[PDB]
Amino acid sequence: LIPIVVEQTGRGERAYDIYSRLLRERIVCVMGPIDDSVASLVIAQLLFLQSESNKKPIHMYINSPGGVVTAGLAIYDTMQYILNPICTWCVGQAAAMGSLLLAAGTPGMRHSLPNSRIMIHQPSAIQAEEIMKLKKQLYNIYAKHTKQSLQVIESAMERDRYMSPMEAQEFGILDKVLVHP
Amino acid sequence: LIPIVVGERAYDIYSRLLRERIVCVMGPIDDSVASLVIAQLLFLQSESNKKPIHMYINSPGGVVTAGLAIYDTMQYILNPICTWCVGQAAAMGSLLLAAGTPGMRHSLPNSRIMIHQPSAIQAEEIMKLKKQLYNIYAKHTKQSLQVIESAMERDRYMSPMEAQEFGILDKVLVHP
Amino acid sequence: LIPIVVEERAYDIYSRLLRERIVCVMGPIDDSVASLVIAQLLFLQSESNKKPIHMYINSPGGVVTAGLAIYDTMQYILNPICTWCVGQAAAMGSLLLAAGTPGMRHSLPNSRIMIHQPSAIQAEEIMKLKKQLYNIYAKHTKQSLQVIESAMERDRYMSPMEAQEFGILDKVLVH
Amino acid sequence: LIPIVVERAYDIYSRLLRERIVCVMGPIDDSVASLVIAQLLFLQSESNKKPIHMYINSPGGVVTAGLAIYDTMQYILNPICTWCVGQAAAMGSLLLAAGTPGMRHSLPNSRIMIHQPSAIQAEEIMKLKKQLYNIYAKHTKQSLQVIESAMERDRYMSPMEAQEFGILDKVLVH
Amino acid sequence: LIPIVVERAYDIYSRLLRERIVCVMGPIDDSVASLVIAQLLFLQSESNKKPIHMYINSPGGVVTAGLAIYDTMQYILNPICTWCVGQAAAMGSLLLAAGTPGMRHSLPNSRIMIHQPSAIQAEEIMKLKKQLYNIYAKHTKQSLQVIESAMERDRYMSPMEAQEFGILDKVLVH
Amino acid sequence: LIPIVVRAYDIYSRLLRERIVCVMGPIDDSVASLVIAQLLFLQSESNKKPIHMYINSPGGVVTAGLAIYDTMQYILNPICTWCVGQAAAMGSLLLAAGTPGMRHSLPNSRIMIHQPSAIQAEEIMKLKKQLYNIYAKHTKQSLQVIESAMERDRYMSPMEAQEFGILDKVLVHPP
Amino acid sequence: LIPIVVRAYDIYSRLLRERIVCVMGPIDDSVASLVIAQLLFLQSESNKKPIHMYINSPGGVVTAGLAIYDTMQYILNPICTWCVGQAAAMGSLLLAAGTPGMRHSLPNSRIMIHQPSAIQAEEIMKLKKQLYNIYAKHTKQSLQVIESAMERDRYMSPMEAQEFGILDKVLV
Amino acid sequence: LIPIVRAYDIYSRLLRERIVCVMGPIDDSVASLVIAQLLFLQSESNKKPIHMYINSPGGVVTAGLAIYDTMQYILNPICTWCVGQAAAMGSLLLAAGTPGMRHSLPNSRIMIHQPSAIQAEEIMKLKKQLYNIYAKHTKQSLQVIESAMERDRYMSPMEAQEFGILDKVL
Amino acid sequence: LIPIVVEGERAYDIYSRLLRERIVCVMGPIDDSVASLVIAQLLFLQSESNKKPIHMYINSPGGVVTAGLAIYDTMQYILNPICTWCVGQAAAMGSLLLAAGTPGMRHSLPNSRIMIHQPSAIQAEEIMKLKKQLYNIYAKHTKQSLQVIESAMERDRYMSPMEAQEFGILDKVLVHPP
Amino acid sequence: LIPIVVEQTGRGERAYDIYSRLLRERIVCVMGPIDDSVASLVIAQLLFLQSESNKKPIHMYINSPGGVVTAGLAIYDTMQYILNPICTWCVGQAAAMGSLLLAAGTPGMRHSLPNSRIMIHQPSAIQAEEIMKLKKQLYNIYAKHTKQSLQVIESAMERDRYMSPMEAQEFGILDKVLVHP
Amino acid sequence: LIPIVVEQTGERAYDIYSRLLRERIVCVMGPIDDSVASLVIAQLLFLQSESNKKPIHMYINSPGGVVTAGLAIYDTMQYILNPICTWCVGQAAAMGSLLLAAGTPGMRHSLPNSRIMIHQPSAIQAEEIMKLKKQLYNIYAKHTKQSLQVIESAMERDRYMSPMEAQEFGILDKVLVH
């Protein structure tokens, strides 16, 4: 499936699959649903890229319908723990937990391409009291990073709809919509 | 197995074709295909901003947001992209074909083109996605929205000569 | 499984209730359910065209065109229809509840009401059906289309007292 | 579970069949066609003059199964009142259209589709569809070009569009 | 198989139903709840004054299906005697507790559990959970803080311990 | 198929008119529901005539067997209990719970008191201790004997189960 | 499937009216309970008239076959057993356990005393030793003869099954 | 499914004409049901013929041998009709009808070959019983039967008549 | 799809590259093959140095008890300090491995969920014997009394990191590296 | 899934998976259920390690529910054939056939961690006589290594119970419990 | 899954089975099928090319399997000139016991607890099933030096035998009291 790409210096060459050459450029891809396996890989790549340097930015590309809340919260906390700046990019869609990871990038470094769909709504094994505690954590994360009030976040998350990138920029999920081709 | 080809180094042909700056979009489009195509496209821009990219489309379409992610990446990148229709380009596949650079959209002569969209989301949001398709088809085909809306309602394929007149294509290579 | 009862003659429990002009719409609604409900509604009009019919609803919703087939039948027949919410009336089941005869729409105190529509035809055809739901709810609840369009976007359930205030019910009653 | 209703007693569908009502509901296939045809030929035997009522709620189905029903509807001498309830799509709208002139009815929220949503040889699939064009033209009184064009659009008519197109005679608006 | 018994003959459950006995056995769902509600409404039509006997052996089930049963028990005018036979867990313990005061019974080895062992929005799960606290607090006379605490412990009560909690009125030594 | 017999009855219905209840195969909540209904029915026809339970079972759900056992102890009738084939786990408890002097076995039946290897650990242990009390009451063994006898993954012959107090008679032929 | 025959019965209810019990196919706890119920009914109608049991079986669960065996031995009725087609494993024990002089076979029936092959090792051998005692009781062979004959994975003809004492008559 | 014609399903109505249908594959369940019908029809009379209608690809050998032995034990004449196909054990039930009462329709296919859990010695003993049954009913030699069973072929009703599987082709 | 890293030079998957940093990822549910792989890495990392710390990152719903007790015993056998990190959740056996880290080196991120309760093939007496081992391990490491552990472990709930720190399952809750 | 590790040779780097690195320390892992595939792998490793030297000990780590009896008896006979001392370590669990491989270590070299579970009972095809033949071989092996009498072994194996390391030591299944520091 | 080992010419590495094959060991473990036969025959023909004089060791732990696959192996063992030492490890049943018995006279070995069975537990015509079993009788009679009447009777009993009893029957030459 994955093609192989080569770097060469005349005295020799080195080859990578594309995702590991993207990782060599410090790019992490979150694509498709988020689960404890996807989190495990994303966590490991973030811990690695901090160990290679704690000062160079990391670039996170999001195209996901979201996924497990506990897995997304593990990725979130690690993005906040590591000292690197994190650029975050939406392509295609960032929905549910995917838009929390988008919102959680470094201020000024949260981006979208013009046709991306953003959803703050959380589409419809645990005790009722514990599911509500998870949502209150989500409300506080969105309020922190968007700088909206909790009352705005709580009512915005109730509407089952997608924002355009311009709606998400004025809401504060994004800093930039890069329309320039 | 994929055949290996050919100091010297030995590549599977998809990596040899990628060394020729060729991206293959084959079969259905999904988030996995979209992530592969986007990674390939961003890599090829890093190899140079100037040299064209060649994009071979044989697909029945697929997920709309996956195709729009590919589309937005094709437009973000600075390189010219030459889109080649081989076999067919239907639904989201004909958007990617039409989104190649003006003068660089090609078909082989027995290809089938379809812009109709055959056959978990609220009704309000499905209509928003389709109006996005109307806008981006209209800008690339230079057609009115009423023509696009009418043409996308007929469940039919069109020949590459019809697609060239409609503006999905620039050149039909009947010659070798 | 299904009990049999004696009254002489004997019937299954649902055939015995049907003799009281009771139609049980329970569970998901589909073309199999719709045709059976419509058959009972047309029969009961032949048995008489004046005496009320009682529809008991416990339903998560279903196919829209199956619910619209039932809705049209309820509005065609001349009988009054009393609608009872029991446990749940969601999506299309809430429209059948709201489409009862004015003054004859009831709930038990713990019923959950939802007019929101949780989530292979063209996009324009999904949007046409959705606008039919707006017209039906506006007609029966007396709310404006803007209110219906806004209330239907929120993914929430509604208590019987709030559904009565919204105009989906006429009575909430304990005994 | 099907309710039983009364000194004889019958299932709800056999009680309706005593009123000369035939329910076409759900997809159409050879076993649905077999059941409908048996009821149609039976109801002609009890009277060749009193009308029959067909209720349609159908996405359509097998083309030759629908054509077997259609040809049975045209062979028997009874008038057939057709009622669209819910939807009549594909082959279901051909059965609706093939009711007796003046006796094709719809409820006001029904959807009608004459489009045929997307094995045998290619040259035979076109021979079936050409029969559909000729059947629709006979009953709808549109030209073959109008129907062949209209039947390519993947859309549903409202009952008022279907009455203007000629598939229906009456919409009972309530 | 189910045995026929017994003039006329019925299956064992129809013969019990003539004694005004309703059996709630196994999990509760919408198809169980509709059967239970239908029998409750029927038995009120025969008389509104003679008791009804509900026999519960259940792990519980769907909350809105149990709330439909509960509301019917409170709606109808009859006394309802509830018998715990082997198990009453989750929603099955609520139906047990919801019997008429003085008419809630257990056999000596029954296990009682008010804990709710484990889609819709979280705000709706918590609203539905809060309704259960008000039902238990009404019927057991415990405070909401007691009910909230006791429903958190993943535990079964003895019949005598459930009588002390107020879920039962009598344990019968058999 | 199950034989019809003749006034024409199912074979198990014809046995039930002889006051015979069959407990065959695994016990579960569905078997318990049927057995308890038959026990309560047979008590209503006579509180004085014995009931016969024929047991061939590998065991089952404990709470389903405890529901049957409590019904046997609630009703006033004597219950004759017959092991045929095997009684194991909960099947041996229903066998042991018959009326003293009225517990019988055929010569080749296998009896197992051992409990061959969704609940909390403290609750599984609380169920297990209820079995120790029931067996000790009916067999007259001490709790330490019962608790150690249950640990051996073993079957008893009918004569050994009679000496242990699970049975009162072993019958080759009618007495 | 099952034809109805004229009162009216299915074919098996009509045979049951003739006091015929068909043990056919594999034996299990479902089959055993059905056979025992018919055996106890037929004794209820008469303790003196014979019962006819027809066997076509590969055998099955030992504990279910021993349940049938104990019921056949308990009831007072004579039981005529007929081997039709085959009687293998537990099926040949029900054949051997018919009343002396009343065990029959058709000419092409195959009889097997061998046992073709959740429980402890000690308990499997205790069941096996019960089989040795039952076959020795009914065939009048010694236990050493039974133990050897059951080890050979073979079928045997009705005439040598009669010689071994599993049958009294072969009817041709 | 089964049409109803007193009233009976179509197979119980034919059973009232003393007709037994052996159609489809033979197994212990089929054998049990055919034997019960055969024994019943003898009880109604021992003198009237039984008519046995066969369309089958074959089946289990010991299931067919159980049917065969019942046909020979019963006193009644058994007329046998091949309709469509008699193969494997179905040809043995056809051949085992009463002399002069074995019939075929004109297009029936007959096969005595045995197309395509037990020890080798016991498989061979079963097949040697087939050789003896076919030899006595067809009156061919064992050497002829053993050779004819090795050819994987069907034969026409006229070949089966001259081989002695049939008496009449109608 | 597991990334490769090149780091003469050699190529590692991301987890082997992290193992060179002395990082062990206990992620997802625990079973015998997870336990086998963790124990082999712990013994390897002790061989490479008996005095440098080891870092265990935990995100797990729990798992087989005897597989977790095998891991626990290996953590207590080796002489190294073990820093333990909760990310996402530590439930059931995952919370015991969290609590079993070295005193002063048990860490949580701010949104981690901690559950001491054990949600729900052997006889009843052996299940209770496993439970009583768990009660003694939690009492040893959290320094609660056995009855407090028994009462706490009966409630089907999750602690916050701050509540688990007050219970003694954690030493630090860290928003950022100090 | 299995991590790779590197061995520092003299001015050189030799890569292994984690299990071949352990095998180079003469460690054999018997983990999960025992079958013919597991037996073949264990027997190959035992015969290999004897060729590398017949005098250095071998270390066998047991975490097993047991398995096929004839597969475990093949392992047992290979342990008894080779000349090496074998240290056997119970980690987590040794049940059924796993406890025979534990008991069959060299005397003085059988170990357990503090929280292991030992079970001699065999939790509940071939002919009846052949199952009892194979069971009687287990009684002989256990009696040889534990030095209990056959009556004590045969009675003990009937109880469906586990036992603690300090009780398996008193029964003679192992020699040392490594109490935690 | 399968270990890797390093050996002198040590600057070469092998999987554990490729290392054993270099010692001239062929492993026949588990059931026999055409793919197992193909791979065993390939190894036997290779090892003869390396030398036609040094012994080959076959290790058998097998239920047996397809008869014609085992007969293909048997004919390859009989074709090649090498001595073949056969070792019964664990069990040799059915076709597995024929390969064991077909080792070179004096070179057929068993471990003490191995189970041996010559009984054949239980798509072609009856005459062909019977013809295959008569070849088995001839092979066993040739190699065990029993008469056909003994072999035919001994295959009818559904039982295993000990290595000492299998030695008395002539299937083995040695039992390794080790």
mmCIF file with all atom_site columns, N, CA and C in Angstrom, chain B residues 116-128 130 134 149 152-153, chain C residues 116-128 130 134 149 152-153:
data_model
loop_
_atom_site.group_PDB
_atom_site.id
_atom_site.type_symbol
_atom_site.label_atom_id
_atom_site.label_alt_id
_atom_site.label_comp_id
_atom_site.label_asym_id
_atom_site.label_entity_id
_atom_site.label_seq_id
_atom_site.pdbx_PDB_ins_code
_atom_site.Cartn_x
_atom_site.Cartn_y
_atom_site.Cartn_z
_atom_site.occupancy
_atom_site.B_iso_or_equiv
_atom_site.pdbx_formal_charge
_atom_site.auth_seq_id
_atom_site.auth_comp_id
_atom_site.auth_asym_id
_atom_site.auth_atom_id
_atom_site.pdbx_PDB_model_num
ATOM 1   N N  . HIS B 1 116 ? -23.111 13.061 -11.795 1.00 0.00 ? 116 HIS B N  1
ATOM 2   C CA . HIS B 1 116 ? -24.172 12.602 -10.907 1.00 0.00 ? 116 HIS B CA 1
ATOM 3   C C  . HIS B 1 116 ? -23.610 11.804 -9.735  1.00 0.00 ? 116 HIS B C  1
ATOM 4   N N  . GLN B 1 117 ? -24.267 11.943 -8.581  1.00 0.00 ? 117 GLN B N  1
ATOM 5   C CA . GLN B 1 117 ? -23.857 11.320 -7.325  1.00 0.00 ? 117 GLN B CA 1
ATOM 6   C C  . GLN B 1 117 ? -24.834 10.205 -6.977  1.00 0.00 ? 117 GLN B C  1
ATOM 7   N N  . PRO B 1 118 ? -24.517 8.948  -7.275  1.00 0.00 ? 118 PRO B N  1
ATOM 8   C CA . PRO B 1 118 ? -25.516 7.884  -7.142  1.00 0.00 ? 118 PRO B CA 1
ATOM 9   C C  . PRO B 1 118 ? -25.819 7.551  -5.689  1.00 0.00 ? 118 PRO B C  1
ATOM 10  N N  . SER B 1 119 ? -27.020 7.012  -5.486  1.00 0.00 ? 119 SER B N  1
ATOM 11  C CA . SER B 1 119 ? -27.502 6.565  -4.179  1.00 0.00 ? 119 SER B CA 1
ATOM 12  C C  . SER B 1 119 ? -27.323 7.621  -3.090  1.00 0.00 ? 119 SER B C  1
ATOM 13  N N  . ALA B 1 120 ? -26.898 9.076  8.853   1.00 0.00 ? 120 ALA B N  1
ATOM 14  C CA . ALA B 1 120 ? -25.833 9.380  9.799   1.00 0.00 ? 120 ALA B CA 1
ATOM 15  C C  . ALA B 1 120 ? -25.598 10.884 9.891   1.00 0.00 ? 120 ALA B C  1
ATOM 16  N N  . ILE B 1 121 ? -26.287 11.641 9.037   1.00 0.00 ? 121 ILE B N  1
ATOM 17  C CA . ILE B 1 121 ? -26.127 13.087 8.949   1.00 0.00 ? 121 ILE B CA 1
ATOM 18  C C  . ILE B 1 121 ? -27.513 13.708 8.837   1.00 0.00 ? 121 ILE B C  1
ATOM 19  N N  . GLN B 1 122 ? -27.662 14.912 9.385   1.00 0.00 ? 122 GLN B N  1
ATOM 20  C CA . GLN B 1 122 ? -28.922 15.631 9.275   1.00 0.00 ? 122 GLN B CA 1
ATOM 21  C C  . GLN B 1 122 ? -29.148 16.143 7.855   1.00 0.00 ? 122 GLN B C  1
ATOM 22  N N  . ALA B 1 123 ? -30.427 16.229 7.480   1.00 0.00 ? 123 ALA B N  1
ATOM 23  C CA . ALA B 1 123 ? -30.806 16.651 6.133   1.00 0.00 ? 123 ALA B CA 1
ATOM 24  C C  . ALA B 1 123 ? -30.217 18.012 5.781   1.00 0.00 ? 123 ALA B C  1
ATOM 25  N N  . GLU B 1 124 ? -30.187 18.927 6.751   1.00 0.00 ? 124 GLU B N  1
ATOM 26  C CA . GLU B 1 124 ? -29.653 20.267 6.532   1.00 0.00 ? 124 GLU B CA 1
ATOM 27  C C  . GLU B 1 124 ? -28.182 20.253 6.140   1.00 0.00 ? 124 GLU B C  1
ATOM 28  N N  . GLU B 1 125 ? -27.416 19.291 6.645   1.00 0.00 ? 125 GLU B N  1
ATOM 29  C CA . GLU B 1 125 ? -25.986 19.212 6.379   1.00 0.00 ? 125 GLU B CA 1
ATOM 30  C C  . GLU B 1 125 ? -25.636 18.466 5.097   1.00 0.00 ? 125 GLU B C  1
ATOM 31  N N  . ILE B 1 126 ? -26.466 17.511 4.681   1.00 0.00 ? 126 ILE B N  1
ATOM 32  C CA . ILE B 1 126 ? -26.290 16.853 3.387   1.00 0.00 ? 126 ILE B CA 1
ATOM 33  C C  . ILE B 1 126 ? -26.521 17.822 2.229   1.00 0.00 ? 126 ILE B C  1
ATOM 34  N N  . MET B 1 127 ? -27.514 18.702 2.351   1.00 0.00 ? 127 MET B N  1
ATOM 35  C CA . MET B 1 127 ? -27.711 19.760 1.362   1.00 0.00 ? 127 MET B CA 1
ATOM 36  C C  . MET B 1 127 ? -26.567 20.769 1.342   1.00 0.00 ? 127 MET B C  1
ATOM 37  N N  . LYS B 1 128 ? -25.974 21.065 2.498   1.00 0.00 ? 128 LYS B N  1
ATOM 38  C CA . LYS B 1 128 ? -24.806 21.942 2.528   1.00 0.00 ? 128 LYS B CA 1
ATOM 39  C C  . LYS B 1 128 ? -23.604 21.348 1.798   1.00 0.00 ? 128 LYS B C  1
ATOM 40  N N  . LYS B 1 130 ? -23.777 19.237 -0.743  1.00 0.00 ? 130 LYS B N  1
ATOM 41  C CA . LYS B 1 130 ? -24.050 19.236 -2.180  1.00 0.00 ? 130 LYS B CA 1
ATOM 42  C C  . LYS B 1 130 ? -23.941 20.623 -2.810  1.00 0.00 ? 130 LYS B C  1
ATOM 43  N N  . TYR B 1 134 ? -21.759 21.868 -6.044  1.00 0.00 ? 134 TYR B N  1
ATOM 44  C CA . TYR B 1 134 ? -22.233 22.767 -7.097  1.00 0.00 ? 134 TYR B CA 1
ATOM 45  C C  . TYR B 1 134 ? -21.304 23.957 -7.315  1.00 0.00 ? 134 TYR B C  1
ATOM 46  N N  . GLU B 1 149 ? -26.686 21.928 -11.389 1.00 0.00 ? 149 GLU B N  1
ATOM 47  C CA . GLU B 1 149 ? -27.778 21.276 -10.666 1.00 0.00 ? 149 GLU B CA 1
ATOM 48  C C  . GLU B 1 149 ? -28.604 20.362 -11.565 1.00 0.00 ? 149 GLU B C  1
ATOM 49  N N  . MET B 1 152 ? -26.263 17.277 -12.727 1.00 0.00 ? 152 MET B N  1
ATOM 50  C CA . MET B 1 152 ? -26.043 16.316 -11.653 1.00 0.00 ? 152 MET B CA 1
ATOM 51  C C  . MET B 1 152 ? -27.287 15.527 -11.268 1.00 0.00 ? 152 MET B C  1
ATOM 52  N N  . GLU B 1 153 ? -28.455 15.872 -11.801 1.00 0.00 ? 153 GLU B N  1
ATOM 53  C CA . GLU B 1 153 ? -29.675 15.143 -11.480 1.00 0.00 ? 153 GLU B CA 1
ATOM 54  C C  . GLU B 1 153 ? -29.907 13.949 -12.397 1.00 0.00 ? 153 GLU B C  1
ATOM 55  N N  . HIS C 2 116 ? -37.005 15.856 17.860  1.00 0.00 ? 116 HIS C N  1
ATOM 56  C CA . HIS C 2 116 ? -35.756 15.696 17.126  1.00 0.00 ? 116 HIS C CA 1
ATOM 57  C C  . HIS C 2 116 ? -35.703 14.353 16.409  1.00 0.00 ? 116 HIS C C  1
ATOM 58  N N  . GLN C 2 117 ? -35.058 14.355 15.240  1.00 0.00 ? 117 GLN C N  1
ATOM 59  C CA . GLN C 2 117 ? -34.965 13.192 14.363  1.00 0.00 ? 117 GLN C CA 1
ATOM 60  C C  . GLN C 2 117 ? -33.540 12.662 14.422  1.00 0.00 ? 117 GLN C C  1
ATOM 61  N N  . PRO C 2 118 ? -33.272 11.629 15.219  1.00 0.00 ? 118 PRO C N  1
ATOM 62  C CA . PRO C 2 118 ? -31.896 11.154 15.391  1.00 0.00 ? 118 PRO C CA 1
ATOM 63  C C  . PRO C 2 118 ? -31.303 10.618 14.098  1.00 0.00 ? 118 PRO C C  1
ATOM 64  N N  . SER C 2 119 ? -29.975 10.571 14.070  1.00 0.00 ? 119 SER C N  1
ATOM 65  C CA . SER C 2 119 ? -29.243 10.011 12.942  1.00 0.00 ? 119 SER C CA 1
ATOM 66  C C  . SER C 2 119 ? -27.959 9.337  13.409  1.00 0.00 ? 119 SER C C  1
ATOM 67  N N  . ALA C 2 120 ? -31.159 6.042  1.338   1.00 0.00 ? 120 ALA C N  1
ATOM 68  C CA . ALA C 2 120 ? -30.496 5.922  0.046   1.00 0.00 ? 120 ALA C CA 1
ATOM 69  C C  . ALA C 2 120 ? -31.247 6.705  -1.027  1.00 0.00 ? 120 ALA C C  1
ATOM 70  N N  . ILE C 2 121 ? -31.485 7.989  -0.756  1.00 0.00 ? 121 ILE C N  1
ATOM 71  C CA . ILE C 2 121 ? -32.172 8.885  -1.675  1.00 0.00 ? 121 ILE C CA 1
ATOM 72  C C  . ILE C 2 121 ? -31.346 10.158 -1.815  1.00 0.00 ? 121 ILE C C  1
ATOM 73  N N  . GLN C 2 122 ? -31.645 10.920 -2.864  1.00 0.00 ? 122 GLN C N  1
ATOM 74  C CA . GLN C 2 122 ? -30.917 12.152 -3.133  1.00 0.00 ? 122 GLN C CA 1
ATOM 75  C C  . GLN C 2 122 ? -31.144 13.201 -2.047  1.00 0.00 ? 122 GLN C C  1
ATOM 76  N N  . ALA C 2 123 ? -30.137 14.066 -1.884  1.00 0.00 ? 123 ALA C N  1
ATOM 77  C CA . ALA C 2 123 ? -30.146 15.104 -0.855  1.00 0.00 ? 123 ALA C CA 1
ATOM 78  C C  . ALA C 2 123 ? -31.397 15.974 -0.909  1.00 0.00 ? 123 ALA C C  1
ATOM 79  N N  . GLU C 2 124 ? -31.796 16.396 -2.111  1.00 0.00 ? 124 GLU C N  1
ATOM 80  C CA . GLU C 2 124 ? -33.001 17.206 -2.267  1.00 0.00 ? 124 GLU C CA 1
ATOM 81  C C  . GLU C 2 124 ? -34.258 16.471 -1.826  1.00 0.00 ? 124 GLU C C  1
ATOM 82  N N  . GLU C 2 125 ? -34.258 15.142 -1.892  1.00 0.00 ? 125 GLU C N  1
ATOM 83  C CA . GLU C 2 125 ? -35.425 14.374 -1.476  1.00 0.00 ? 125 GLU C CA 1
ATOM 84  C C  . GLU C 2 125 ? -35.491 14.166 0.034   1.00 0.00 ? 125 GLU C C  1
ATOM 85  N N  . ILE C 2 126 ? -34.345 14.075 0.710   1.00 0.00 ? 126 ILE C N  1
ATOM 86  C CA . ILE C 2 126 ? -34.335 14.082 2.172   1.00 0.00 ? 126 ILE C CA 1
ATOM 87  C C  . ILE C 2 126 ? -34.848 15.410 2.715   1.00 0.00 ? 126 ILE C C  1
ATOM 88  N N  . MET C 2 127 ? -34.427 16.517 2.106   1.00 0.00 ? 127 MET C N  1
ATOM 89  C CA . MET C 2 127 ? -34.847 17.845 2.544   1.00 0.00 ? 127 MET C CA 1
ATOM 90  C C  . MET C 2 127 ? -36.326 18.121 2.282   1.00 0.00 ? 127 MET C C  1
ATOM 91  N N  . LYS C 2 128 ? -36.886 17.578 1.201   1.00 0.00 ? 128 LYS C N  1
ATOM 92  C CA . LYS C 2 128 ? -38.328 17.668 0.976   1.00 0.00 ? 128 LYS C CA 1
ATOM 93  C C  . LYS C 2 128 ? -39.141 16.954 2.054   1.00 0.00 ? 128 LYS C C  1
ATOM 94  N N  . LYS C 2 130 ? -38.173 16.300 5.149   1.00 0.00 ? 130 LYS C N  1
ATOM 95  C CA . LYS C 2 130 ? -37.990 17.052 6.389   1.00 0.00 ? 130 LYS C CA 1
ATOM 96  C C  . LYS C 2 130 ? -38.913 18.265 6.485   1.00 0.00 ? 130 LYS C C  1
ATOM 97  N N  . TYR C 2 134 ? -41.912 19.573 9.250   1.00 0.00 ? 134 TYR C N  1
ATOM 98  C CA . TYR C 2 134 ? -42.137 20.931 9.746   1.00 0.00 ? 134 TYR C CA 1
ATOM 99  C C  . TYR C 2 134 ? -43.580 21.397 9.573   1.00 0.00 ? 134 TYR C C  1
ATOM 100 N N  . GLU C 2 149 ? -38.507 24.359 13.392  1.00 0.00 ? 149 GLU C N  1
ATOM 101 C CA . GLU C 2 149 ? -37.171 24.153 12.833  1.00 0.00 ? 149 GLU C CA 1
ATOM 102 C C  . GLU C 2 149 ? -36.076 24.267 13.890  1.00 0.00 ? 149 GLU C C  1
ATOM 103 N N  . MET C 2 152 ? -36.465 21.211 16.622  1.00 0.00 ? 152 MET C N  1
ATOM 104 C CA . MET C 2 152 ? -36.106 19.903 16.092  1.00 0.00 ? 152 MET C CA 1
ATOM 105 C C  . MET C 2 152 ? -34.603 19.709 15.923  1.00 0.00 ? 152 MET C C  1
ATOM 106 N N  . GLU C 2 153 ? -33.808 20.777 15.994  1.00 0.00 ? 153 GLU C N  1
ATOM 107 C CA . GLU C 2 153 ? -32.362 20.658 15.848  1.00 0.00 ? 153 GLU C CA 1
ATOM 108 C C  . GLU C 2 153 ? -31.663 20.222 17.132  1.00 0.00 ? 153 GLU C C  1
#
